[PDB]
Design a binder for this molecule. Sequence first.
Ligand code: C5Q
Ligand code: C5Q
Ligand code: C5Q
Ligand code: C5Q
Lengths: 148, 148
Amino acid sequence: SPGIWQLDCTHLEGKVILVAVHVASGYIEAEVIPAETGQETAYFLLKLAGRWPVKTVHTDNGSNFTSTTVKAACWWAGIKQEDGIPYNPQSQGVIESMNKELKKIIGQVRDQAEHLKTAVQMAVFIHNHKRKYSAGERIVDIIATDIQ
Amino acid sequence: SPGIWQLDCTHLEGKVILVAVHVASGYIEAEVIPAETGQETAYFLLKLAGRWPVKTVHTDNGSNFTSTTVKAACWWAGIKQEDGIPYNPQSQGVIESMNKELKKIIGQVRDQAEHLKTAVQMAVFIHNHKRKYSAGERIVDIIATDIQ
Ligand SMILES: O=C(O)c1c(Cc2c[nH]c3ccccc23)ccc2c1OCO2
Ligand SMILES: O=C(O)c1c(Cc2c[nH]c3ccccc23)ccc2c1OCO2
Ligand SMILES: O=C(O)c1c(Cc2c[nH]c3ccccc23)ccc2c1OCO2
Ligand SMILES: O=C(O)c1c(Cc2c[nH]c3ccccc23)ccc2c1OCO2
């Protein structure tokens, strides 16, 4: 459970927002990309796995699940690539709600930033710091407990 | 202290590698940028602070220490901006050695990747996972201990 992440892709301003969610904590990392290619997804996963102990990734769609470049990146980084089917059907709505929530935060800051990418990183910040414990606190606690 | 980071800028292939080091653990995040502008540094710090609890940043030079954009980003993200003078003179060589180490790792992978940015993220991965405890383990343990 501490090593499980879910990929998520949502759209805004004709652009693509790629999100990785640490399932047990709700902690996220995100980036803006021109389009969701294998190359972009691969690079995003490499960055993620260099920063957090990523054991398993539930991919966001069949194209990324099939992508040879994504498979290569997962091999390189020691990531088990899995499908992202909501076997628990509440897993659709939880992601839908996060996307809605992210876009809402982006709207609240959009005017502060000239570029969408800045607004997205402001949203990551606000999300991970928000007291609900914060997601940042939860991921650290979960991984630390696993270590020791 | 758990919230203290140091900025570091090094050069390779006519490009700039911007690094943030968590001082107590040796954990790093890094990016390739065309040049070290206030705007790029500001964005990098925003990303960092959205992902880890960044309380204090020792800046890498006077230009970033003075930059109005960097100051704005530090205000936004709740970061105390400080100078990075090696008051302990071993603080120069520790960074020099990390830069040498990073460039060495980049050399070991450079052929695997077409783009420098990919090689840099491979280097971040290798660095943070390297057993010496790993830096990834240390940062989580340090921050978790602080939380509790
Ligand atoms: O498969 C890729 O090209 C790719 C990879 C994995 C990888 C790079 N070199 C390799 C050489 C041998 C095996 C895998 C790789 C990681 C991040 C990326 C990638 O593309 C962009 O971001
Ligand atoms: O795998 C790591 O060294 C690493 C760790 C801690 C850890 C040590 N053993 C483990 C075995 C399983 C899971 C995590 C670890 C923490 C953060 C990271 C890491 O890599 C990048 O971000
Ligand atoms: O100061 C910036 O422009 C900047 C900032 C801080 C910030 C943005 N809007 C604001 C509006 C009011 C106050 C500060 C800001 C963060 C990240 C960045 C930045 O530039 C690129 O990455
Ligand atoms: O600020 C957070 O909630 C947050 C935390 C927990 C934390 C808050 N203050 C601290 C002061 C010191 C140490 C941890 C925290 C952890 C990771 C994060 C966080 O945000 C981004 O990554």
